[PDB]
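Exercise: predict the structure of this protein bound to ammonium ion.
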Amino acid sequence: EVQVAVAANFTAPIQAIAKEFEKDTGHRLVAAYGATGQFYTQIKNGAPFQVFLSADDSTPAKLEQEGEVVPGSRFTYAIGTLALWSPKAGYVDAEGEVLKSGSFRHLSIANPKTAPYGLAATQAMDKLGLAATLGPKLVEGQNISQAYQFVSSGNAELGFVALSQIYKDGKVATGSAWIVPTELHDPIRQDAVILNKGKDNAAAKALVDYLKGAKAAALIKSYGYEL
Ligand SMILES: [N+]
Ligand SMILES: [N+]
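Solution:
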């Protein structure tokens, strides 16, 4: 009974939370996935979403200034991490020296105009002093899921991906990765919000309470997010 717009980094997490949420509360979570920025437009245009799980905090804040949000509704549900990643175990070294030494032609990022995880990537390359040399090599996905898939499918040698896409059981579980240290970019604070069409909706209220709950908190951290 709850239409949720879900930033692509949070695709697998919400599919998992949706299964326990349905069983526990009886309300069905119907999720659309995509870039935070694309949902900003859809919401502005009348999309039926009732809850919005952003990959940032500024987009929910922007929507509230423009009257699309229930005041009092904004909270942080997860804090993400950026990783440089390749499915090839020898390719991305433990310190990220490939960004400086590598011979790759394609570096995958999510569209930084719509994807907070892409913005974190361009902040990190900028603070590394590598924006001018890596810029020509960039290939932009429409969201962090597409950016990841470019690397997984071999359309780019490596990419800046969401930790949630490669992390299981407290560990990067596949390929080779460098965890981007936070000082290189703004913390990836991911905020949730009840939208106008979710005001006074029982499933919407149940969901945000659930996201703050014990079963949701354990799943969220199992994908590498901090709370
Ligand atoms: N930056
Ligand atoms: N820091």
